[PDB]
Design a protein around this nucleic acid. Structure first.
Ligand SMILES: [Mg+2]
Ligand SMILES: [Mg+2]
Ligand SMILES: [Mg+2]
Ligand SMILES: [Mg+2]
Ligand SMILES: [Mg+2]
Ligand SMILES: [Mg+2]
Ligand SMILES: [Mg+2]
Ligand SMILES: [Mg+2]
Ligand SMILES: [Mg+2]
Ligand SMILES: [Mg+2]
Ligand SMILES: [Mg+2]
Ligand SMILES: [Mg+2]
Ligand SMILES: [Mg+2]
Ligand SMILES: [Mg+2]
Ligand SMILES: [Mg+2]
Ligand SMILES: [Mg+2]
Ligand SMILES: [Mg+2]
Ligand SMILES: [Mg+2]
Ligand SMILES: [Mg+2]
Ligand SMILES: [Mg+2]
Ligand SMILES: [Mg+2]
Ligand SMILES: [Mg+2]
Ligand SMILES: [Mg+2]
Ligand SMILES: [Mg+2]
Ligand SMILES: [Mg+2]
Ligand SMILES: [Mg+2]
Ligand SMILES: [Mg+2]
Ligand SMILES: [Mg+2]
Ligand SMILES: [Mg+2]
Ligand SMILES: [Mg+2]
Ligand SMILES: [Mg+2]
Ligand SMILES: [Mg+2]
Ligand SMILES: [Mg+2]
Ligand SMILES: [Mg+2]
Ligand SMILES: [Mg+2]
Ligand SMILES: [Mg+2]
Ligand SMILES: [Mg+2]
Ligand SMILES: [Mg+2]
Ligand SMILES: [Mg+2]
Ligand SMILES: [Mg+2]
Ligand SMILES: [Mg+2]
Ligand SMILES: [Mg+2]
Ligand SMILES: [Mg+2]
Ligand SMILES: [Mg+2]
Ligand SMILES: [Mg+2]
Ligand SMILES: [Mg+2]
Ligand SMILES: [Mg+2]
Ligand SMILES: [Mg+2]
Ligand SMILES: [Mg+2]
Ligand SMILES: [Mg+2]
Ligand SMILES: [Mg+2]
Ligand SMILES: [Mg+2]
Ligand SMILES: [Mg+2]
Ligand SMILES: [Mg+2]
Ligand SMILES: [Mg+2]
Ligand SMILES: [Mg+2]
Ligand SMILES: [Mg+2]
Ligand SMILES: [Mg+2]
Ligand SMILES: [Mg+2]
Ligand SMILES: [Mg+2]
Ligand SMILES: [Mg+2]
Ligand SMILES: [Mg+2]
Ligand SMILES: [Mg+2]
Ligand SMILES: [Mg+2]
Ligand SMILES: [Mg+2]
Ligand SMILES: [Mg+2]
Ligand SMILES: [Mg+2]
Ligand SMILES: [Mg+2]
Ligand SMILES: [Mg+2]
Ligand SMILES: [Mg+2]
Ligand SMILES: [Mg+2]
Ligand SMILES: [Mg+2]
Ligand SMILES: [Mg+2]
Ligand SMILES: [Mg+2]
Ligand SMILES: [Mg+2]
Ligand SMILES: [Mg+2]
Ligand SMILES: [Mg+2]
Ligand SMILES: [Mg+2]
Ligand SMILES: [Mg+2]
Ligand SMILES: [Mg+2]
Ligand SMILES: [Mg+2]
Ligand SMILES: [Mg+2]
Ligand SMILES: [Mg+2]
Ligand SMILES: [Mg+2]
Ligand SMILES: [Mg+2]
Ligand SMILES: [Mg+2]
Ligand SMILES: [Mg+2]
Ligand SMILES: [Mg+2]
Ligand SMILES: [Mg+2]
Ligand SMILES: [Mg+2]
Ligand SMILES: [Mg+2]
Ligand SMILES: [Mg+2]
Ligand SMILES: [Mg+2]
Ligand SMILES: [Mg+2]
Ligand SMILES: [Mg+2]
Ligand SMILES: [Mg+2]
Ligand SMILES: [Mg+2]
Ligand SMILES: [Mg+2]
Ligand SMILES: [Mg+2]
Ligand SMILES: [Mg+2]
Ligand SMILES: [Mg+2]
Ligand SMILES: [Mg+2]
Ligand SMILES: [Mg+2]
Ligand SMILES: [Mg+2]
Ligand SMILES: [Mg+2]
Ligand SMILES: [Mg+2]
Ligand SMILES: [Mg+2]
Ligand SMILES: [Mg+2]
Ligand SMILES: [Mg+2]
Ligand SMILES: [Mg+2]
Ligand SMILES: [Mg+2]
Ligand SMILES: [Mg+2]
Ligand SMILES: [Mg+2]
Ligand SMILES: [Mg+2]
Ligand SMILES: [Mg+2]
Ligand SMILES: [Mg+2]
Ligand SMILES: [Mg+2]
Ligand SMILES: [Mg+2]
Ligand SMILES: [Mg+2]
Ligand SMILES: [Mg+2]
Ligand SMILES: [Mg+2]
Ligand SMILES: [Mg+2]
Ligand SMILES: [Mg+2]
Ligand SMILES: [Mg+2]
Ligand SMILES: [Mg+2]
Ligand SMILES: [Mg+2]
Ligand SMILES: [Mg+2]
Ligand SMILES: [Mg+2]
Ligand SMILES: [Mg+2]
Ligand SMILES: [Mg+2]
Ligand SMILES: [Mg+2]
Ligand SMILES: [Mg+2]
Ligand SMILES: [Mg+2]
Ligand SMILES: [Mg+2]
Ligand SMILES: [Mg+2]
Ligand SMILES: [Mg+2]
Ligand SMILES: [Mg+2]
Ligand SMILES: [Mg+2]
Ligand SMILES: [Mg+2]
Ligand SMILES: [Mg+2]
Ligand SMILES: [Mg+2]
Ligand SMILES: [Mg+2]
Ligand SMILES: [Mg+2]
Ligand SMILES: [Mg+2]
Ligand SMILES: [Mg+2]
Ligand SMILES: [Mg+2]
Ligand SMILES: [Mg+2]
Ligand SMILES: [Mg+2]
Ligand SMILES: [Mg+2]
Ligand SMILES: [Mg+2]
Ligand SMILES: [Mg+2]
Ligand SMILES: [Mg+2]
Ligand SMILES: [Mg+2]
Ligand SMILES: [Mg+2]
Ligand SMILES: [Mg+2]
Ligand SMILES: [Mg+2]
Ligand SMILES: [Mg+2]
Ligand SMILES: [Mg+2]
Ligand SMILES: [Mg+2]
Ligand SMILES: [Mg+2]
Ligand SMILES: [Mg+2]
Ligand SMILES: [Mg+2]
Ligand SMILES: [Mg+2]
Ligand SMILES: [Mg+2]
Ligand SMILES: [Mg+2]
Ligand SMILES: [Mg+2]
Ligand SMILES: [Mg+2]
Ligand SMILES: [Mg+2]
Ligand SMILES: [Mg+2]
Ligand SMILES: [Mg+2]
Ligand SMILES: [Mg+2]
Ligand SMILES: [Mg+2]
Ligand SMILES: [Mg+2]
Ligand SMILES: [Mg+2]
Ligand SMILES: [Mg+2]
Ligand SMILES: [Mg+2]
Ligand SMILES: [Mg+2]
Ligand SMILES: [Mg+2]
Ligand SMILES: [Mg+2]
Ligand SMILES: [Mg+2]
Ligand SMILES: [Mg+2]
Ligand SMILES: [Mg+2]
Ligand SMILES: [Mg+2]
Ligand SMILES: [Mg+2]
Ligand SMILES: [Mg+2]
Ligand SMILES: [Mg+2]
Ligand SMILES: [Mg+2]
Ligand SMILES: [Mg+2]
Ligand SMILES: [Mg+2]
Ligand SMILES: [Mg+2]
Ligand SMILES: [Mg+2]
Ligand SMILES: [Mg+2]
Ligand SMILES: [Mg+2]
Ligand SMILES: [Mg+2]
Ligand SMILES: [Mg+2]
Ligand SMILES: [Mg+2]
Ligand SMILES: [Mg+2]
Ligand SMILES: [Mg+2]
Ligand SMILES: [Mg+2]
Ligand SMILES: [Mg+2]
Ligand SMILES: [Mg+2]
Ligand SMILES: [Mg+2]
Ligand SMILES: [Mg+2]
Ligand SMILES: [Mg+2]
Ligand SMILES: [Mg+2]
Ligand SMILES: [Mg+2]
Ligand SMILES: [Mg+2]
Ligand SMILES: [Mg+2]
Ligand SMILES: [Mg+2]
Ligand SMILES: [Mg+2]
Ligand SMILES: [Mg+2]
Ligand SMILES: [Mg+2]
Ligand SMILES: [Mg+2]
Ligand SMILES: [Mg+2]
Ligand SMILES: [Mg+2]
Ligand SMILES: [Mg+2]
Ligand SMILES: [Mg+2]
Ligand SMILES: [Mg+2]
Ligand SMILES: [Mg+2]
Ligand SMILES: [Mg+2]
Ligand SMILES: [Mg+2]
Ligand SMILES: [Mg+2]
Ligand SMILES: [Mg+2]
Ligand SMILES: [Mg+2]
Ligand SMILES: [Mg+2]
Ligand SMILES: [Mg+2]
Ligand SMILES: [Mg+2]
Ligand SMILES: [Mg+2]
Ligand SMILES: [Mg+2]
Ligand SMILES: [Mg+2]
Ligand SMILES: [Mg+2]
Lengths: 275, 48
RNA sequence: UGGUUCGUGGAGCCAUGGGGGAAUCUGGGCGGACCACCGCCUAAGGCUAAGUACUCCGGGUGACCGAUAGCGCACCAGUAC
RNA sequence: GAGCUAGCCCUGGCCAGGGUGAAGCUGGGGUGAGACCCAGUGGAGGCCCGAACCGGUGGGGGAUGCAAACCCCUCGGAUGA
RNA sequence: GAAUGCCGGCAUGAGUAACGAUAAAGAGGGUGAGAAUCCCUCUCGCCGUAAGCCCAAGGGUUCCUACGCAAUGGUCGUCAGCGUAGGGUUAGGCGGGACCUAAGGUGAAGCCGAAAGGCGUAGCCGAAGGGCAGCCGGUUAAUAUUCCGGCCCUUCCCGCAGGUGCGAUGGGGGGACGCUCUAGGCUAGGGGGACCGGAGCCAUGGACGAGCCCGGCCAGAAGCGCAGGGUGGGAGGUAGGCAAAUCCGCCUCCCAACAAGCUCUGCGUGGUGGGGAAGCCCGGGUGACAACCCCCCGAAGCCAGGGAGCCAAGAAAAGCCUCUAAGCACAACCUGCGGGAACCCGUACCGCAAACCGACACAGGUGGGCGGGUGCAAGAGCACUCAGGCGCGCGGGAGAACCCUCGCCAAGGAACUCUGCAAGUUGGCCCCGUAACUUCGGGAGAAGGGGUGCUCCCUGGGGUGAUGAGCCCCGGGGAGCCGCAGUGAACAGGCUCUGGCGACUGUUUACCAAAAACACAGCUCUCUGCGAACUCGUAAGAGGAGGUAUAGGGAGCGACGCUUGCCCGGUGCCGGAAGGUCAAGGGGAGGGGUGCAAGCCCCGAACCGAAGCCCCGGUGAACGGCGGCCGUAACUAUAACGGUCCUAAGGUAGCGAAAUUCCUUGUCGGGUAAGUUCCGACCUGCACGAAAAGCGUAACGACCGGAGCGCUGUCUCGGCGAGGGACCCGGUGAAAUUGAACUGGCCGUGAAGAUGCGGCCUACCCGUGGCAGGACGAAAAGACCCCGUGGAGCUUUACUGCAGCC
RNA sequence: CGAUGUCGGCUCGUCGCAUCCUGGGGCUGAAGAAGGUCCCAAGGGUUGGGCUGUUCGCCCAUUAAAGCGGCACGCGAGCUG
RNA sequence: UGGGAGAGGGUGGUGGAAUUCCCGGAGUAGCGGUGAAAUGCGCAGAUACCGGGAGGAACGCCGAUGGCGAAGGCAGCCACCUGGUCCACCCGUGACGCUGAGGCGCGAAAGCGUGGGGAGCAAACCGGAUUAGAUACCCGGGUAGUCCACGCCCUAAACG
RNA sequence: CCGAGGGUAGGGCCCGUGACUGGGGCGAAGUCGUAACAAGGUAGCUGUACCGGAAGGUGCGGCUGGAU
């Protein structure tokens, strides 16, 4: 559920927050956290290379295990599910029987007290990790590697998932969260289930301040600027765009495709995204 | 109101200091010039 | 592409970023597209005094200044500020 | 040249007193169970009043100033972007 | 001789403005050549969440003393932050370094770049963060947690004793963390005391009193007590913590568990050491053998790493504990004791300011801590006041205009004016009471009203005690007293109605705009499959993001409600293996130059040959666009209807004289005696209209309109009064400006607005306070306008190129 | 154009007379009262308010009357803005 | 107590037919559509045919003048949870009953909020026809919606 | 003290009236079309929804109070 508020200030009227119902442990695992170097959107030259970032709550980085093929056959107990400020998904605390502890992103349905495992022989159940070639076609899966041994890259955002659609030689064919149809290699790991916290998308920030907490600084329309600044700048009074609507840097921004044409992975993308 | 000189000794040495000047081709050329000119002080005097 | 007086010109020569790519004197480059003839010269390794430039420095000399001039400074000045 | 100013980064510090009284929780009532209602408790919030602090609305004064942007009166924010 | 020339000197304005907060002064004494200004005393006033005190920056001798007064000081000066000299800053425990890491910086490895140079995991640097051992008093002219005294403590070296598998830069624990709220017990700090100690006092009508006035503490090892923090113990397994590990992690079992124990801290006590007032005598003496006790209040501080709740989910590293590795186990490490050892830098003084930033001893600016008492509901607010510190480095008179700041005002009460601009009114707390509308929160402090002092009597509950007394807190009821008046002073909302805009708190043009502008939650379009797109960079490398389509970029719109129509011909974007065009290159029919020749060299048609463009289609919350004429209805008028030209299609819903309406003060209605504004309507909309969104919308607004009540010196319409200036006298003493001047009025004249020319008129010489008509007054080589084949910012389907992309 | 500050208002006037009123008069289609029209006359007077930035104008209520012009569209080293 | 029938309700699964689109193959000049046509689609290779895939929706035959429910209404198959109801036995209770103003719940479709989903169909809308005209009927397109979850709405020729 | 009433302020219900505006009834001598009644020339009606000069149309679902 998302949580509502009575309109006892003008902002609480529309603000909603997550319910955090799945959360069972309110403090990170000290050996699995490290400091996050906050950037402001500035690169190593000092220059802002991404606008309007800065000023959010402080965060510790929780180290996530996006490999998992790292510990084949060694099962683990799900110790706790926790809040993770670095992602929309919650994260799950794993206690391997080995004694090693790691985090994974928490799939929808994962229960604390339950066991998970990774490897070619893992049961096809929620929370387990296997190479794609061993997962029954039709099953929905998350945290997918894009190339073998290179780490989970696909379906990690709250509520996302890919579904295995079929196989072809060394590859299986997934339907990505975008609806893109892609061949991923059969040897790539993936975890059965969808990512949790699926109500994430229904949160209503509610006030300027809450974006401010997220490290999102105010964003300013090209229209509200001047010609030195932006193609849409200037003009006396309000103005329509007066040219094809553009980015600050002049490239067109309603429709112009931008994916590089001759890119090697084109050979592996079967169908571009939907809608 | 708050004016523009707000002395700070560390800021002065880190910024205009002898070592700062040497670290850079441009800064070393300031020293070349101030030496060629006979400057008594090549670098802001600062108390330390 | 640069260099040359040569700004694409009939544009050779010298140099070379890209591609191709030899020969050892019956070899090669050159004499302003190119060809012939007639000549000149020996590429793709290196060094080499002197005659030449300059004036922080020392000295000599002015139909040069003479303290608002002459160096910014005749003086504790690249100082005070 | 960011010792002013603008943004961001790291690490610290500050915000009198007063008011309103969200969720929850407890008890009562209600019902098949419920929703829900009432009371108490609770103490939320770019909530309220108002110092510090941050501002600079209106007016007057200043105008070779006290000041190359000040003064008095008034006024905005004051747990938060 | 002129360049608003340059440099310098000296005039003018002028004995003029001014002498820098309106907190405020007076007198007596001293000193000295000289005194409003220096010292001393008494009186007066100001600050007192400071205008007192302590730290950090910055400053750099300004500190203290002696001797000085040319200059510096807005006056004076005997004085001084000034001149000369002399002195003065003392640390194992404070701060920083011989400790740690943060951003960031630098940088073995490594990467990149014409050179210079740019990056870069480790490492190193980097602190106001972490770590770390000192408290109280005394002393100097001037330093003191530094010297001294007293009581405590840290590390290193060595040794002795006891103990133990010792050993690390490697493994682990820990260090270690948010915001709001908050419990218990303390402490700081404070109030009272009939109790304790004290020099003394009885005035002026009364008081020898349970009188007045003054004080009634500080630090302290172990032990002890109180309150807290931290923390389970044993055993077995073990494949993880890039070696090892008995540690840590994981599994199992046993005992313990809102206990304890152990351990660390706070506080109390505690051997001891210190301090110790008023007043009175000259900083010191005394008071004094000072007393040093009880009760109440009580933190934002401490115990602390406490507790709850919440979402935005809250540094690192060392110290420290533990584990083992090379080793070494006569070693080494731990514990206790003893002796020795313990370096460098800072330390003066200013520090909300006359010593810092503002050219000035400048009404400005400057981070942290302390910041007493009483009353006012509270408070860091306000008034007064303690300690402490000040009267602001020109004064003395006078009592005009005028100006500033301030107080009052008959009758009227907005008639003022662009505007109630400004000033009134209102004003705190308690109680009663409170509308439309609403998103059900609100609107609300709506509005409006009543109460408010003191005295006596009765009485309810809480805290501290003990259950009681005393003390402190929150009330209730009764009877009365006084004044014009009881938040009696000071601090402290005027209100209502109705429209526009913007939902809202926020942001902005530092220094003429705070807004309706920007932002904002929220809505849509679009790009992006991850070595993402995108941005910065030549590159390497970064950001994006240690993120992964519930994510990231770009764009527009702007809470929310009801909505968002038609046109894809043009431009854009998307899609389109056809077709047309299409460069280098390929190809080489054919042709040429030259040579005796082989040959060498040149031109070159067909034809093959990308993107782009053409072309075909899509696409509007992509750029954009969204008609005209003729006729027609029982009288006129109008035209539901018909016809016709044009177009890519001809404006839908809603709204409409509008932040848009030219004509225009449209017309009609409302409000007023009177309404170019305002509100409601109408609709021939010059020239609204649906995300450059349309129409609404509760709540909000130092936004912009219109009206009403309240109340006023805004006004009829002005008067009086106050203080600071203006004025006079002493002191000090500017400025712009200035061709020179012996510088009147009229009517004319003149380059067309005359002190300066003509004619007339008028007029003795020279000032002071005032007024502003003129000197086309001053300032600023007009900012508008034009001109210059002058500049610069910006735009695009101007030209031409470049990055970038294909 | 090396600057002659610009609308309206306020304040302060002063002048012209082609006179709004008041005084004198001729003609009248002047019985009277009241008017019209012209002439002489500038001594004095010439109101308060609603609208609008307005000047102007319209309007309310009065009046003997509610004059029109000049003075750099009088007057910003006099104020406003 | 023992038995029965049934698209009664809820959840979870799950099968094949068809349509659509995508991929491969093969193939050529039309297909489609109507009263007849046109728009549309098709030599940029459509239609028709084969194989592969994706996806949503509805469940042909059985099927009925059938069944179940209070009504709205309910239909592939499977399991689980669950209501109503009928029969037989004549075992138990001993009038414990009927109706029911208010109240409470359920209530087709369309519609609405948030989020999914979207093959076919299809208001609005575009275009072709028909026609005197044709904002219709018919033809080619087409968005809400139709579908799912959760919350609303509370109507009906909700009829026997 | 209470007290007729007076005054101030804010509420509630009712009636009259109002620029303008929405439909309604009627009149009828008109314009436009022909929606229903026949299979009414697209069976009708229906709740809802979107739409159109107008009766109306179409979608979805329902009823027969449908002709053949
Ligand atoms: Mg809410
Ligand atoms: Mg709620
Ligand atoms: Mg509210
Ligand atoms: Mg709100
Ligand atoms: Mg959760
Ligand atoms: Mg959940
Ligand atoms: Mg935490
Ligand atoms: Mg760590
Ligand atoms: Mg990180
Ligand atoms: Mg860096
Ligand atoms: Mg950006
Ligand atoms: Mg940024
Ligand atoms: Mg999370
Ligand atoms: Mg969330
Ligand atoms: Mg969203
Ligand atoms: Mg955050
Ligand atoms: Mg954003
Ligand atoms: Mg914006
Ligand atoms: Mg703008
Ligand atoms: Mg702008
Ligand atoms: Mg710029
Ligand atoms: Mg530009
Ligand atoms: Mg531009
Ligand atoms: Mg523009
Ligand atoms: Mg424009
Ligand atoms: Mg603009
Ligand atoms: Mg304009
Ligand atoms: Mg415009
Ligand atoms: Mg603009
Ligand atoms: Mg424009
Ligand atoms: Mg536009
Ligand atoms: Mg345009
Ligand atoms: Mg790939
Ligand atoms: Mg500063
Ligand atoms: Mg410093
Ligand atoms: Mg510093
Ligand atoms: Mg600094
Ligand atoms: Mg330096
Ligand atoms: Mg020297
Ligand atoms: Mg230098
Ligand atoms: Mg030529
Ligand atoms: Mg050449
Ligand atoms: Mg070469
Ligand atoms: Mg030869
Ligand atoms: Mg040869
Ligand atoms: Mg050669
Ligand atoms: Mg030659
Ligand atoms: Mg030669
Ligand atoms: Mg020689
Ligand atoms: Mg030589
Ligand atoms: Mg000289
Ligand atoms: Mg010299
Ligand atoms: Mg000189
Ligand atoms: Mg000198
Ligand atoms: Mg110098
Ligand atoms: Mg911090
Ligand atoms: Mg605050
Ligand atoms: Mg709530
Ligand atoms: Mg609770
Ligand atoms: Mg607030
Ligand atoms: Mg507030
Ligand atoms: Mg104050
Ligand atoms: Mg101001
Ligand atoms: Mg005011
Ligand atoms: Mg002024
Ligand atoms: Mg000024
Ligand atoms: Mg003030
Ligand atoms: Mg105020
Ligand atoms: Mg605020
Ligand atoms: Mg406030
Ligand atoms: Mg706020
Ligand atoms: Mg001359
Ligand atoms: Mg001059
Ligand atoms: Mg000069
Ligand atoms: Mg000069
Ligand atoms: Mg004078
Ligand atoms: Mg003067
Ligand atoms: Mg002065
Ligand atoms: Mg003074
Ligand atoms: Mg004053
Ligand atoms: Mg004196
Ligand atoms: Mg003297
Ligand atoms: Mg003195
Ligand atoms: Mg100094
Ligand atoms: Mg000193
Ligand atoms: Mg002197
Ligand atoms: Mg002197
Ligand atoms: Mg003297
Ligand atoms: Mg002086
Ligand atoms: Mg001075
Ligand atoms: Mg003397
Ligand atoms: Mg001094
Ligand atoms: Mg010591
Ligand atoms: Mg050492
Ligand atoms: Mg270090
Ligand atoms: Mg430190
Ligand atoms: Mg101590
Ligand atoms: Mg000393
Ligand atoms: Mg031991
Ligand atoms: Mg260790
Ligand atoms: Mg941590
Ligand atoms: Mg910390
Ligand atoms: Mg103490
Ligand atoms: Mg007290
Ligand atoms: Mg083990
Ligand atoms: Mg004593
Ligand atoms: Mg004694
Ligand atoms: Mg680190
Ligand atoms: Mg040393
Ligand atoms: Mg010291
Ligand atoms: Mg101050
Ligand atoms: Mg300066
Ligand atoms: Mg002074
Ligand atoms: Mg008070
Ligand atoms: Mg108070
Ligand atoms: Mg004074
Ligand atoms: Mg006088
Ligand atoms: Mg009066
Ligand atoms: Mg009034
Ligand atoms: Mg009145
Ligand atoms: Mg007004
Ligand atoms: Mg008050
Ligand atoms: Mg009302
Ligand atoms: Mg309400
Ligand atoms: Mg009130
Ligand atoms: Mg009294
Ligand atoms: Mg006061
Ligand atoms: Mg107030
Ligand atoms: Mg109102
Ligand atoms: Mg308006
Ligand atoms: Mg606003
Ligand atoms: Mg705004
Ligand atoms: Mg709104
Ligand atoms: Mg908004
Ligand atoms: Mg806002
Ligand atoms: Mg400005
Ligand atoms: Mg400004
Ligand atoms: Mg400026
Ligand atoms: Mg200003
Ligand atoms: Mg402004
Ligand atoms: Mg404002
Ligand atoms: Mg703005
Ligand atoms: Mg805005
Ligand atoms: Mg919106
Ligand atoms: Mg770039
Ligand atoms: Mg990189
Ligand atoms: Mg990163
Ligand atoms: Mg991301
Ligand atoms: Mg905006
Ligand atoms: Mg509404
Ligand atoms: Mg239309
Ligand atoms: Mg178009
Ligand atoms: Mg188009
Ligand atoms: Mg165009
Ligand atoms: Mg073909
Ligand atoms: Mg040939
Ligand atoms: Mg167009
Ligand atoms: Mg547009
Ligand atoms: Mg007619
Ligand atoms: Mg209109
Ligand atoms: Mg009007
Ligand atoms: Mg309007
Ligand atoms: Mg406007
Ligand atoms: Mg308009
Ligand atoms: Mg108009
Ligand atoms: Mg107009
Ligand atoms: Mg008019
Ligand atoms: Mg108006
Ligand atoms: Mg106006
Ligand atoms: Mg009209
Ligand atoms: Mg726009
Ligand atoms: Mg607009
Ligand atoms: Mg638009
Ligand atoms: Mg509107
Ligand atoms: Mg509104
Ligand atoms: Mg506002
Ligand atoms: Mg405002
Ligand atoms: Mg007055
Ligand atoms: Mg007075
Ligand atoms: Mg006076
Ligand atoms: Mg006076
Ligand atoms: Mg005199
Ligand atoms: Mg003369
Ligand atoms: Mg003249
Ligand atoms: Mg004259
Ligand atoms: Mg003369
Ligand atoms: Mg005369
Ligand atoms: Mg004058
Ligand atoms: Mg004047
Ligand atoms: Mg003159
Ligand atoms: Mg003048
Ligand atoms: Mg010039
Ligand atoms: Mg000029
Ligand atoms: Mg000019
Ligand atoms: Mg001109
Ligand atoms: Mg030209
Ligand atoms: Mg010319
Ligand atoms: Mg030019
Ligand atoms: Mg230019
Ligand atoms: Mg691009
Ligand atoms: Mg001019
Ligand atoms: Mg001038
Ligand atoms: Mg002038
Ligand atoms: Mg003007
Ligand atoms: Mg008569
Ligand atoms: Mg008569
Ligand atoms: Mg007269
Ligand atoms: Mg006269
Ligand atoms: Mg007017
Ligand atoms: Mg007018
Ligand atoms: Mg008369
Ligand atoms: Mg004129
Ligand atoms: Mg004028
Ligand atoms: Mg004027
Ligand atoms: Mg002026
Ligand atoms: Mg004027
Ligand atoms: Mg003037
Ligand atoms: Mg003048
Ligand atoms: Mg004046
Ligand atoms: Mg049946
Ligand atoms: Mg029986
Ligand atoms: Mg229903
Ligand atoms: Mg439905
Ligand atoms: Mg529907
Ligand atoms: Mg039926
Ligand atoms: Mg009466
Ligand atoms: Mg019909
Ligand atoms: Mg029909
Ligand atoms: Mg029509
Ligand atoms: Mg239709
Ligand atoms: Mg039915």
């Amino acid at each position: 559920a998302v949580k509502k508020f009575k309109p006892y200030t003008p902002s609480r009227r529309f603000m909603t927050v997550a319910d955090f119902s799945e959360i069972t442990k309110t403090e990170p695992e000290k050996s699995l956290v490290k400091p996050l170097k906050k950037t402001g959107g500035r690169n190593n030259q000092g220059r802002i290379t991404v606008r309007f970032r800065g000023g959010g709550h402080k965060r510790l980085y929780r180290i996530i295990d996006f490999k998992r093929w790292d510990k084949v056959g060694i099962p683990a107990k799900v110790a706790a599910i926790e809040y993770d400020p670095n992602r929309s998904a919650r994260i799950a605390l794993l206690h391997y029987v080995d004694g090693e502890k790691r985090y994974i992103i928490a799939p929808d349905g994962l229960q604390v007290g339950q066991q998970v495992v990774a490897g070619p022989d893992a049961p096809i159940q929620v929370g387990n990790a296997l190479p794609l070639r061993f997962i029954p076609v039709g099953t929905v899966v998350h945290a997918v590697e894009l190339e073998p041994k290179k780490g989970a890259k696909l379906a990690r955002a709250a509520g996302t998932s890919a579904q295995i659609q079929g196989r072809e030689g060394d590859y299986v064919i997934l339907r990505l969260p975008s609806g893109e149809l892609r061949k991923v290699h059969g040897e790539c790991y993936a975890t059965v289930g969808a990512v949790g916290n699926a109500d994430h998308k229904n949160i209503v920030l509610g006030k300027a301040g809450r974006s401010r907490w997220l490290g999102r600084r105010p964003h300013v329309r090209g229209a509200a600027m001047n010609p030195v600044d932006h193609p849409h700048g200037g003009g006396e009074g309000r103005a329509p765009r007066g040219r094809p609507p553009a980015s600050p840097w002049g490239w067109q921004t309603k429709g112009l495709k931008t994916r590089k044409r001759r890119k090697p992975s084109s050979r592996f993308i079967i169908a571009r995204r939907k809608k | 109101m708050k004016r523009t000189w707000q002395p700070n000794r560390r800021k002065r040495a880190k910024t205009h200091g002898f070592r700062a000047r040497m670290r850079t081709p441009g800064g070393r050329k300031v020293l070349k010039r101030r030496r060629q000119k006979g400057r008594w002080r090549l670098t802001p005097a600062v108390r330390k």
